[PDB]
Design a protein around this ligand. Structure first.
Ligand SMILES: Nc1nc2c(ncn2[C@@H]2O[C@H](COP(=O)(O)OP(=O)(O)OP(=O)(O)O)[C@@H](O)[C@H]2O)c(=O)[nH]1
Ligand SMILES: Nc1nc2c(ncn2[C@@H]2O[C@H](COP(=O)(O)OP(=O)(O)OP(=O)(O)O)[C@@H](O)[C@H]2O)c(=O)[nH]1
Ligand SMILES: [Mg+2]
Ligand SMILES: [Mg+2]
Lengths: 52, 163, 58, 169
């Protein structure tokens, strides 16, 4: 059995990569994948800087 | 308005979402991810997020908390063994700064069953009378039959309309 | 830990930081076994972003 | 095109020496490595030309991801451990598979028969035969004896790659 995180990430990453609810999906991705806190900070700072 | 539907796996979250959207029971599978639909009640639109409740994915619920106006917390009234789990998830979530001002409605679901706990036991087990700085109510629901939903939603909407 | 998590973190970090995004989008959609309809939508969107960058002066 | 930054992939089975080669090319020395679960990409300067060189991890389960990186590839450096008699057939089948990809049609192939400093190393000729290289009619290819640790053969292999790229139709 595939780790269930894969199914979870397929849904989250599809949404994110299609530009839908990207700040939320970025939080989820960085959490699910257990990124080191410094990388997470960098990723979420760049997400916030996306101009509408 | 943004609403989260939370609760353990099997509680009836997804069944409630589509009952609210299309007034019918739908077949479900365990939600490994989330469902999102906009729902129209009393000429008003809510974006409702139904988050999966399986053990391994419960920890990700907090990722979705930013800008939440209300939580519908769905609890299987027949599941006496895991009401303690629901209570610990409810305590943990209400400590989150992001939900400081959120309205909490608890749906004591599966009340169509004879094995259902009463609204009263459930409030006590969930620690609801002890909650401070919180607007909250509990309601008896069956997502399959349809009972109690229209009335819980009347309360949530009016409470949101009043701040 | 799944081998794929370490791999996905390296790849997602570059993607989310805006580096080699097309290549990374291909990798992510392959690793996670996306269906080809969704993959082509995602890749079409990357190609459109790069097309809008190449044709804009500013 | 010689003027412009070109793209090289370094591929091959885990343990072949890919990451060691990448950094010997970039900084001129042997560096300590771990198993690459992902990739390393570095800008490499060779004969004052700039290469975007991608060193992709060779563990079995992440080899299916190699093809994601094939777009716009000018050359593949295919690294083969000259002492690994058990897996030369696996190196062969991964090579056969990648050379079917349309994304790689334009790419030149340079095979580094690596770890030739070792006593039990297979000869270049035995390896070329084992990999099926003489059957690659439609592919510009050459095989070179190399040692990433001792530096031998790298400059000659790279000189051939650069001459071959310059000669492209
Ligand atoms: N008897 C009864 N069964 C219900 C009721 N509501 C939902 N169910 C059933 O409970 C089971 C689980 O319902 P779901 O809606 O999929 O549960 P969920 O909370 O979304 O579960 P996850 O997706 O894992 O988080 C299904 O078989 C439903 O038909 C109810 O009110 N009464
Ligand atoms: N004797 C000898 N050892 C080498 C040579 N090249 C690499 N090695 C060693 O072989 C081991 C593996 O080398 P790497 O560069 O990590 O192998 P890799 O191909 O990058 O492997 P993955 O990252 O799993 O894809 C290391 O201990 C290197 O020092 C060589 O030419 N001669
Ligand atoms: Mg569900
Ligand atoms: Mg390596």
């Amino acid at each position: 059995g595939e780790p269930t995180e894969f199914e979870y990430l397929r849904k989250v990453l599809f949404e994110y990569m299609m530009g839908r609810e990207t700040k939320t999906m970025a939080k989820v991705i960085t959490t699910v994948l257990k990124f080191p806190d410094d990388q997470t900070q960098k990723i979420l700072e760049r997400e916030d800087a996306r101009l509408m | 308005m943004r609403i989260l539907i939370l609760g353990l796996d099997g509680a009836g979250k997804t069944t409630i979402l589509y009952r609210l959207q299309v007034g019918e029971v739908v077949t479900t599978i365990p939600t490994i991810g989330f469902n999102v639909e906009t729902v129209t009640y009393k000429n008003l639109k809510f974006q409702v997020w139904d988050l999966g409740g399986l053990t391994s994915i419960r920890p990700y619920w907090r990722c979705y908390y930013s800008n939440t106006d209300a939580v519908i917390y769905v609890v299987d009234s027949c599941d006496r063994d895991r009401i303690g789990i629901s209570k610990s998830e409810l305590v943990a979530m209400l400590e989150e700064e992001e939900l400081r001002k959120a309205i909490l409605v608890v749906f004591a679901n599966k009340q169509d069953m004879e094995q259902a706990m009463t609204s009263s036991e459930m409030a006590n087990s969930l620690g609801l009378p002890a909650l401070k700085d919180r607007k909250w109510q509990i309601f008896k629901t069956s997502a399959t039959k349809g009972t109690g939903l229209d009335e819980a939603m009347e309360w949530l909407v009016e409470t949101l309309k009043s701040r």
